[PDB]
Amino acid sequence: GPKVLCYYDGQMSLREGLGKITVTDIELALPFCTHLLYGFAGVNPETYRLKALDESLELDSGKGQYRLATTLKRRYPNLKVLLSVGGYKDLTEEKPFEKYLTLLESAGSRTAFVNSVYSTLKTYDFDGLDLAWQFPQTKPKRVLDPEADEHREEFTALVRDLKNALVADNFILGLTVLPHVNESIFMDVPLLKDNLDYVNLASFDQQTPERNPKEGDYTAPIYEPSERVEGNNVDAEASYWLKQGTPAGKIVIGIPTYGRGWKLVEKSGITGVPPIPADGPSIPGPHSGINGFYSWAEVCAKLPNPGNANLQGADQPLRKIGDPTRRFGAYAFRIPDENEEHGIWLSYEDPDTAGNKAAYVKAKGLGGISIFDLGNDDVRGACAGDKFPILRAAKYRLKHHH
Ligand SMILES: *[C@@H]1O[C@H](CO)[C@@H](O[C@@H]2O[C@H](CO)[C@@H](O)[C@H](O)[C@H]2NC(C)=O)[C@H](O)[C@H]1NC(C)=O
Q1: CATH H superfamily, domain 3-256+350-399
Q2: How many CB atoms lie within 10 A of CB 54?
Q3: Which candidate among 142, 208, 300, 328 keeps its CA 20 to 30 Å from the CA of 50?
């Protein structure tokens, strides 16, 4: 059956107010998921063993959230609970990818990591590992790894080692290719595929305020928008893996549940059409405090709704631009006023466009979807009354014809 890999970022239980999303809060999502990917573990740069990113939260000596997550497998029949390592959330050094490269460089360091994965899965009763490896990201338009060729071969060996250590206990091992990770530099697909239960293509964040502060564009297109960066769309990345010989059933497509916003200025123009000049991220989400980053509930609150129908200023509803091609995605915007104020351009996933991605997976015979992430879906049903609308629309279109 098709996979639905649902990420829960445990950091969200640390948030304040309506930003706090706990394990309990995401339980209503679990009937729609085949796997719960608990995010995120990291790597100790001195021992190369797995580490929790917040020990006080995750470990038995603290709040024990690892075990709260794995207990879910005893209340939701057939649900598999994996631990995801990396995800670009392991951010404790100035170059957060460096330890993900040096780990690969010796049998001793690879073995330390493998042994620490096995011990961690057993200790906390995880069902397997999602390898969301923090390779360096390709630089934004305007050398990535001088030892890329060495590291590519060492990564094949690491994945082989993990598989051989995990197989006796039937632990799941999957690979997640994070945004802007170039597989043709770092990954030997024909020598990886046989050791992986899935390959999850996190084909989103194609444009972001952090990488492209001066230009807004579609964050998660299915196909290539005209004259964009070749490869940076779902169809291109899935086809890359297929053309390397990967079984279609092993390929899973990542779907974001969030939006990213850019501040608009005078040089942005007045049409809202991308790519659009900008000046960094827009205002932080009301419930998270993260600049230019919005959960689906936060995006939907900015779109035309009865509460803000005739509101003005920072509250004036955004203009939605639907995508009739269904190839590129939705965006919404407010042109800056005559004082260059309150301008925002927001590219986001919604239930309809997430459904389009799941329907693409079904039509192409791929293996499933992943959801990045449950807590950025509309957990509480604030947008339209229905909880987990993005997840539910994607799951529905993954299995039901249009
Ligand atoms: C990933 O790396 C490869 C090289 O390993 C890049 O390959 C280039 O692809 C473009 C088309 O997108 C070609 O015009 C170039 O001739 C290719 N060069 C090489 C050396 O192969 C690829 O573009 C990279 N992709 C990203 C997104 O960075």
Answers
A1: Glycosidases (3.20.20.80)
A2: 16
A3: 208
